[PDB]
Amino acid sequence: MSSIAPHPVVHVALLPSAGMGHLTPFLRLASLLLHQHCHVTLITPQPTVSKAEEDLLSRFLSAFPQVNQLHFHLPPTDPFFLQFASIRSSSHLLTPLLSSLTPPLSSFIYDMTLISPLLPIAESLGVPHYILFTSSATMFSFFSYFPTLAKSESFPGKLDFVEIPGVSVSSIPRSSIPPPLLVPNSLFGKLFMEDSPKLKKLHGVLVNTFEGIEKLSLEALNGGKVVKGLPPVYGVGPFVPCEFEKVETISEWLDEQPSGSVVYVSFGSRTAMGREQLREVGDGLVKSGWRFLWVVKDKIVDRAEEEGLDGVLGFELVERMVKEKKGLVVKEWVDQSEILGHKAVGGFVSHCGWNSVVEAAWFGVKILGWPLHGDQKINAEVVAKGGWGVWKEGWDWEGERLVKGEEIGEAIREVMNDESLVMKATQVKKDARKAISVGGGCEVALQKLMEVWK
Template sequence: MSISDALQSHPPHVALLPSAGMGHLTPFLRLAVQLVRHHCRVTLITAHPTVSLAESQFISRFFSAFPQVSQVQFHLLPLDLSSANSTDPFFLGFEAMRRSAHLLSPLLASLSPPLHAFIYDVSLISSVIPVIEALNIPNYILFTSSARMFSFFSYFPTFTSKSNDDPAVFDDVVEIPGLMPVPKSSIPPLLLIPNNLFAKIFKEDSYKVAKLTGVFINTFEGLEAESLEALNGGKVREGLPSVFAVGPLAVCEFERVECGDQLKWLDEQPVGSVVYVSFGSRTAMSRDQIREIGNGLIKSGCRFLWVVKDKKVDKEEEEGLENVVGHELMERMKGKGLVVKTWVDQGEILAHRAVGGFVSHCGWNSVVEAAWHGVPILAWPQHGDQKINAEVVERSGLGMWVRSWGWGEQVVVKGEEIGERIREMMESKLLRREAAGVKEEGRKALRDGGSCGITFMRLFEEWQMSNRSI
């Protein structure tokens, strides 16, 4: 019997557990779709409550589209905020899940048929491993960033041991074996602040990576060949598990949301003439910076579709667009572009023929979506892993990065410079050509016989073998 026949007659059963925030949830649901398409039996474990409205709506649309996926609710214990040392709602969501992780044991043990694999969020490693080891289930994480960032994450224990865990004496560069160094200026800023919740989770989990069965990353060789080779070649750190490039995890049909006005407006614009501006689902900018972006868009002379975000969590978005952007600026932008302050269908926008460039924070999902559609990026990292992801954008040829802009809110970048850089991106034939090449590599990975399909078949064979041996 062939592997394909075996999968159809005895499909592997895989459970997935995403963590808080759309940046973590989105790749998990796209991975779930790929597993379903490869004839897996899938159980999605959903944490309650969610942090944002967007998450709960996204999960509902997913289950409506894929009724064959089983849902198990994971009810989180109340979190004592005074003991968490953070005010970030998403990091608090991570911590609530970590402190509730022991409740997973009976939940996972009760699943039928027994699991072949459990795939969970990177932010849960040190809390989930004791549970999963007791149950003897192969365990994987979905690392919700780039392979370059995973190299840094994996190497972090070695790096910090050299500096006695004191961020003040971290070297100016992190020399990761087999890879280009990471400058200190690209390290997620919260890692340089002692005793905050993000740094605590990052440190605890990076030490435990060697206990994983494997790591999934939403990437592909045409985007990150060097990092993937270093990780799987044993250069970054001894004892690392296999890293599986399962990308590009493309936008799925269930993700479509009603954005008729935006698409209608795009339909009226010339091919490649529109710059799309969005900084993701959890980046809230200052009013001063928002208004400089508006001025920059006007000065660029380009048509634009701009998504404005004023609060980290969508449930807190109360003020109207004119209050946030300013009445005068809104008047000046009339006829030049479209400004919205709602959740948009980013995949649909990036796929549109009128879109010729993307001003992005370089959240990893946004980078992969731009790569999938061959849209050049002007990288403007705001926080977290985004400078490391911006390096990938620049080195792969997918886009350009203005390092002098620093992190979001470090400095207010002036509209004149923003306009100049947008114009540079939109006029660059080289960037368009390079981005088209990255797109073609991504499409190749997903074609029949491509690297993504081969990776899944290898995994399924391993799961079938491990299940027989348990």
Template sequence: MSPSEPVVHVAFLPSAGMGHLNPCLRIATLFLRHGCKVTLITPKPTVSTAESNLVSRFCSSFPHQATQIDLNPATVNTNDPFWLQFETIRRSVHLVAPILSSLSTPLSAFIYDISLISPLVPITQKLSCPSYMYFVASARMFSFFAHLHVLAASDPSSQPHPSSFIGDGVKIPGIASPIPRSSVPPLLLQPNSLFESIFMEDSAKVTKLNGVFINSFEEMEGEALAALNEGKVVKGLPPVYGVGPLMTCEFEEVEQGKGGCMGSVLEWLDEKSEGSVVYVCFGNRTATRREQIKDMALGLTESGYSFLWVVKLKGGDKEEEEGLEDVLGSKLMSKVKEKGMVVKEYVYQMEILGHPAVGGFVNHGGWNSIIECVWQGVPILSWAQGGDQKIASEAVRISGVGIWPQEWGWGSEHVVNGKEIADRIKEMMENESLRVKAKEMKKAARNAAGVGGRCEVIVKKLIEEWKKNV
């Protein structure tokens, strides 16, 4: 950008959790790469060390203005530290207004997390600042979220709850297959839960935004993106921008593969033949239930494939007092060590998925993980554990890049036995049509995010629009 051109200045405000922070920083990087000035407003303290480290690396990698807000403590009906942080940030956003007002360079746009719509819309309207939201899940999930207030309006009660107005399923205009009640995030069906209150309050406010960013692309979710942008899901909905795949950026690649855990992992993978390893990981905050651990180990060992298993026995950043052998016993642990490698530390997932030895990914249906897997062209076995993950798993099945054993239910519902797990792993690893489709989707993903691709076209067009108002 030449000195004579107007400066496009974009501010970002993430929420809690790596799954919310990563997309925010990756979208910020898109605009930085196209010459925009970026201000990152980060709530402190963060919930996890991983979040804090990622923010630090981002701030070290890019020249921009970083501002922190001290959070107002909140007391709400949840024991989940991440949901508590969501509500804490919502109650602290009044601190954002003076920050935005005091910026030396006028603001062109403010982009923030989905969980902050209701408290931030009045602030951006008062400041006459274009307001955008980034959505951390699939376009299919966003269509459900945006349509929720329409469904609520059909309930005659004064305080409608999804548990009452969502019947056997939800038919969303423009989307062929309904979302069954069994796929609705469980917390949304719990009256007066924090998740329900945020969703119910924010769904109706989406039309007040100037746009929505989603980590998806047409080949992966063309039906949902079209329904959203053609006004079928909700009348008056702002543009929904599929800017995916949002991939690993420079600030995330610091020290990857050098020593420590990742060094050992890569050395182990280097010894394996192409496409022979099953990678198993349920995200950075999802703990595997003790009751499921043994059958998971049995399924992996009986599948016949080598495996890299990232095991979390506790959620979040909590220290784990007991080891895997305490849960499995020495005999089963010996079998695990014969066929696989077990990791309990944070791993750089993209580097693992991109390794030639990895031939399949057993995951929890987390949307970021799914998109990263699609980018690398690796088939998926999606086992939803909670939240939007069944809806994401359905997108995996519809797109043809993986399988979703619906009969397994939620990860916390019941124990899936080892034989079932082994059979499904074999299906994922040996189904040629999955492998072909995964490779096709990989090519489409690279085209969408490459030079001249749809993501670049969207970003450049927005920047040109914002320049007109500078």
């Protein structure tokens, strides 16, 4: 009535660390913020470990030319862990690029693996600053609680159960603890010890989760039950898959299969089974009798792939799969969300990386959990507690045992024959939509955050 002005711009800077499991939720968060009319600066540590990260970033930036990319050129062990440490070690060199941002920065959201080097930088900027935690809220509870465990003089040798008050997995046995945390000199063990005590300095923690799958962990974190004085935890999931991620023979094959008849199999973007274990997967898929879409990795890093899929699988397995005409096997980057959203896919053999879990939740696809490393056993039990997936506790971390094709096929048939899992997965899918609708946890949290930043 008394002013005609360019309405103020909320400017968010984002900093993702290594791996598709970190880039993907940051770019989906970016898309959400852009839809709330934020200006977004994206800091891109270069070069990326994997080609998939490289190509996704390119597709994102061409989909959103309004995004301001800040190049973060890194100086020249698990290759993604090595990148985590390099980004961390070079982070103190981001201050001049963040200080010079225009329009004025409103908030700063950085990767949970970068807390210690970035915290003083964020405090220098004088804006609300946050981590985006890319794993489950239950895993975040474990992360927050870790200094309480590691203070013990019998850590890590004497620790049989981790029972965090009020969370979605009330008892985490030692066999589900991320294995590096039980080795007394690992990168993540040191990161946990240096970073978790500094959580209280953040303005908040964003998590790609929602009440439909982690109601208890969300309530425990925000009620002071996990660690007193933790910053507010915002359930801003489910992160809905976005158009820019798409890159047509797979979808054409899925178009030919009966509804719900295909078992999708993938163990993420950075994990490769051993050769013998990999071939047992194929044996189990054939033995299951179900149609399957099996995504194979022979190397951790896609750039390192060097053997043809026929040689990886071997003559005998290839021969059985081509003869029965029930499965499709690919050693390439697929559009996992396009696949999970296809009516033909009725189940998901997943390593239970958190992004894959929440995608399965979004599409209501029941899970056969096969956790392999890291946070995956905790995530598998978050799913199983909700009754929309199952996992076999005795299969153990990848490389500890050889899971045979007979028991893989039995587990696949068990999950695909279980209609109670579909019922619960469909209610999760219903709640996934509630979370992003007006009044849902994600809509409420984003409006809170936007109002603080304004």
